[PDB]
Amino acid sequence: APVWGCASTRGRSAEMEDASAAVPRFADVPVRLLASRRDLDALGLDADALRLPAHLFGVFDGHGGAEVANYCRERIHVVLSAALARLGKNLGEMGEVDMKEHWDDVFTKCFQRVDDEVSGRVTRVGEVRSEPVTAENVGSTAVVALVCSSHVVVANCGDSRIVLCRGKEPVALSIDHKPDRKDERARIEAQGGKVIQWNGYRVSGWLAMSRSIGDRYLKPFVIPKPEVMVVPRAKDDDCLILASDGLWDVVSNEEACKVARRQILLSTDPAAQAAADYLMRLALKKGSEDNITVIVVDLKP
Template sequence: MMMNSLDDHGTFSLSSLTTCRQIAGCSSMLDVTAARRRRSEFRPLKLLSNEDGGFRKSERYENLDNHGNRDDDFPHHSSVIGRRREMEDAVRVEVGFVNDNSREFDFYGVYDGHGGSRVSFECCERLHRLLAEKMKMEMKMENGSMNWERLMIESFTKMDEEVNEGGLAESVGSTAVVAVVSDDEIAVANCGDSRAVLSRDGATMPLSSDHKPDRHDELERIERSGGAVIDWNGQRVMGVLATSRSIGDRQFYPYIIAKPEVTVNKREDEDEFIILASDGLWDVISNDLACHVVRKCLDGRIICRKNSQETNDNQYRMTNAAVVLTKLAMARGSKDNISVIVVNLKD
C-alpha cells in the first residue's frame, strides 16, 4: 500500500502495520522490531487525518509567510505558528541570490525569534543581502575563492549591529541558521539552537551544533564573561534565555554573542538533501527520523499536501516534505513555532 491517498484534509492515515513496514523500509518479518519502532514514531500522523482533531480548525496551524499571512505556495519550506500566541519564526529562500556567471549560489535561512518577532523578521529581510554584498566583494579578488567563515561572521556581526543600532533588540533576539549552496560547496552558519542536517547516501550528517547554555564550551564562555547559567524551567542564561547565542538581545551582552559557528562541506554525488529548521522541530524529532521522513517524501511515498497537481515536481516534493515535518512535530507535541526548509540536492 503506497501512502499516496489523501483524505478530506489533504492528509493520510497510517492504518496498517503493512503500510508502516513499507514506510520504515522493512521487507521481511525479521524487521518486525524496526517496523514497530517506526510505527510508534509515525503514529502521531494518524491524528492529522482525524476530522475532529482540530489541527486545521484554526489558522494558527496553517502555513504563514513572514508577515503572518496564510499562503498555499511555499517553495521548499513550511512555517507554522503552532501552539504559540505569536509567530516569531521567519524563513528566507533566495535561489540564485548571487551569480558571478561561472557559479550560482542559493541561500536558505531560518530565524527563530524570542521576546517578539522584530529581530527575526529584520534578519529575514537583511542578512542574505549583507552576505551577498560581501560575497560579491570577495569575487572581485584574484583567486575568487570564498572564505566562508570570515564572510559569515562579518555578515552576522553587521546584522547584530544593525538591529542594536535601530533599537530593536534591547530585550528581543533571534537565532539564525543559514546555508549557502553552490554546485561544489555547502556552507552553513549557525547562531543559536536552530539546526541544519545533511543526508548523504542514507546517512545523517549534522551541519551545525546547537548553542545551548549547558553545552560545555558555551557554559565556560558564559561564566568567563561574568554570566551564569541557571536552571529555571531548563538551563537558561541568567535564568532567561534557553539559547547561548543569538542576534540581538543587547541586554545580555557579553554573555549572549552573535558570532556563528561555520561549517563548509564539499558537495558529493551521494548528497541527497538538507533540512534547516527551528528548534520547534528538533525538540520533538530526531535528526535521523527527520531525514527518514524527508527521504520518503522525496521518493513520493508520503504525500500530505492538499490541492497538489504536480506531485512529481521536485519543488512540490520539497515543500511537501517540509509540510509533513511541521505536521509531525505538531502531532508529537511541539509547543513552539515550527519552521522547516528542505533542499533537494539531487535536483
C-alpha cells in the first residue's frame, strides 16, 4: 500500500479546472524495464515472469475548460496500465533492450493515445465514442509519477512539476515546458511557429506552455510528447511533491520541500495529507489566485 496525500482547491479562481489521480496497484511493471535479463538469470529468476506492484500519481492542470484534465484523470492510468501489460508480454520474445528508451516509448505512446482520444481522432470506450471530447481550444498539463518499491518513473507534459526531496534537498524531476525555453523555442520556430512575449512568453502569443494534451488547434507547435526520467529510490528520499503551477508560481522547490518534511515528521495517510494540505494553504497565503493541487507521496518505510 502506498503512502500519499492529496489536496486540491479551486482557490480564488472562478471555477476548478485542476484534476488529480492517485491509483494504488494500477499496474505491474515489467522488470525487464528496470533490470536486464542477464542480471536476473544469474540468480535463476525469470525477468519476464516477475511481478512488481506499482502506483500511479498524476496532476492535470487544464485550461480552456476542465474536461481534458478530467479525461486525463480517468484515462491516463488505464491506458498506461494496459500498455505496461502488453509490453511485458512483448519483452518475452525480445532479447536485450534499452530500458530508458522503452520508458520514453511507453509514456510517449500513452500520452499520444489519450491526446488522440481527446481530439476524436480515434474511438474510445460498452458504448463507443468517436467525436472529440471537447473544443479545439481546451487542453491540460500532465505530470505523472509511476511509483514502485525500487524506482520512481516521471513523465511530464506542461508547466506542472514534480520535485523529489533527497538528502534534505529538493531535486526537480521535471523541467517546465515554457515556450521561451531554448530547446522549446528552437523547436517551435523550426516549424514556422512563433514564441511571442504577450503577457509572458506564449506559443503564437496564446499558450503559456509549449507542451500539453489536447489543444489541437495549436498543433504542431504544442505537442503531447512527454519528458521521461527514471529515478532509482534511496534511503535519503523523504517525499514526492506533485503539483500544478498554482503552487510553483509562489513557492520554490526548497520552500516546498522544507515544509513537506516537517509536517510529515510530525485511502490517504494523515501525515502526507497534512503536508499536502499545508503546502496547498501555503500557496494561498503567498498571493496565488489560481487553482491549487498538491500530491505528497511519502517515500520512507
